[PDB]
Design an enzyme around this catalytic site. Structure first.
Site, PDB file in Angstrom:
ATOM      1  N   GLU A  11       0.798  -1.180   0.000  1.00  0.00           N
ATOM      2  CA  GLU A  11       0.000   0.000   0.000  1.00  0.00           C
ATOM      3  C   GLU A  11       0.853   1.260   0.000  1.00  0.00           C
ATOM      4  OE1 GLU A  11      -2.732  -0.059  -0.476  1.00  0.00           O
ATOM      5  OE2 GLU A  11      -3.771  -1.928   0.016  1.00  0.00           O
ATOM      6  N   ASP A  20      -6.320   4.193  -6.096  1.00  0.00           N
ATOM      7  CA  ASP A  20      -5.658   2.916  -6.115  1.00  0.00           C
ATOM      8  C   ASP A  20      -5.761   2.286  -7.506  1.00  0.00           C
ATOM      9  OD1 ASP A  20      -8.296   1.986  -6.376  1.00  0.00           O
ATOM     10  OD2 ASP A  20      -8.320   0.980  -4.401  1.00  0.00           O
ATOM     11  N   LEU A  32      -9.344   3.180   1.979  1.00  0.00           N
ATOM     12  CA  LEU A  32     -10.374   3.516   0.993  1.00  0.00           C
ATOM     13  C   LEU A  32     -11.294   4.590   1.521  1.00  0.00           C
ATOM     14  CD1 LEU A  32     -12.033   2.482  -1.916  1.00  0.00           C
ATOM     15  CD2 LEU A  32     -13.697   2.132  -0.117  1.00  0.00           C
ATOM     16  N   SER A 117     -10.643 -20.882  -5.424  1.00  0.00           N
ATOM     17  CA  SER A 117      -9.328 -20.608  -4.884  1.00  0.00           C
ATOM     18  C   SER A 117      -9.273 -20.862  -3.384  1.00  0.00           C
ATOM     19  CB  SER A 117      -8.988 -19.180  -5.203  1.00  0.00           C
ATOM     20  OG  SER A 117      -9.117 -19.000  -6.598  1.00  0.00           O
TER      21      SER A 117
END
Length: 164
Positions: A11, A20, A32, A117
């Site tokens: 970040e 971003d 955010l 995933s």
């Protein structure tokens, strides 16, 4: 290296509003502000979050404060999410950090959507997980970061953050 360091490495730190890789107004260490396309909204959000008239810029400690809260919020949503908690509990320390990383960035509901995933990670099918993660939009939008996070799940080492 720990989860925080990992995050800080990805970040970075900005004291002014920026967008971003997801295209959202963000500040400090991956904070955010808004999914809205308006700077005014982000600006409002900023002040609200800060508690003072920042006029678009914050301090390093302010960032630090937001960051602790944001990490807490990522750990909280994992723990409470039935789709994330078991994954989390089953992973080793380094891989847990990668899961926090994803949550912190996209949110609990976003990650929770990577059904396959998630299953693969939980079953230790590291290469399968990796291939799968690389098929997302997330990867196309934030390839550097995503590669880094992905390499971590695949290897279980800190190799990707070694120069950080």
């Amino acid at each position: 290296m720990n989860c925080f360091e990992m995050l800080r490495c990805d970040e970075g730190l900005r004291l002014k509003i920026y967008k971003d890789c997801e295209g959202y107004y963000t500040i400090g260490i991956g904070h955010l502000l808004t999914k809205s396309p308006s700077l005014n909204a982000a600006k409002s959000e900023l002040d609200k979050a800060i508690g003072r008239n920042t006029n678009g810029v914050i301090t390093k400690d302010e960032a630090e404060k937001l960051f602790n809260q944001d990490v807490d919020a990522a750990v909280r949503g994992i723990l409470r999410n039935a789709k994330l908690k078991p994954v989390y509990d089953s992973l080793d320390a380094v891989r847990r950090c990668a899961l926090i990383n994803m949550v912190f960035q996209m949110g609990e509901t976003g990650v929770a959507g990577f059904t396959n995933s998630l299953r693969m990670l939980q079953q230790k099918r590291w290469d399968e997980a990796a291939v799968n993660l690389a098929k997302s939009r997330w990867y196309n939008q934030c390839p550097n970061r995503a590669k880094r996070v992905i390499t971590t799940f695949r290897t279980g080492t800190w190799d990707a953050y070694k120069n950080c």
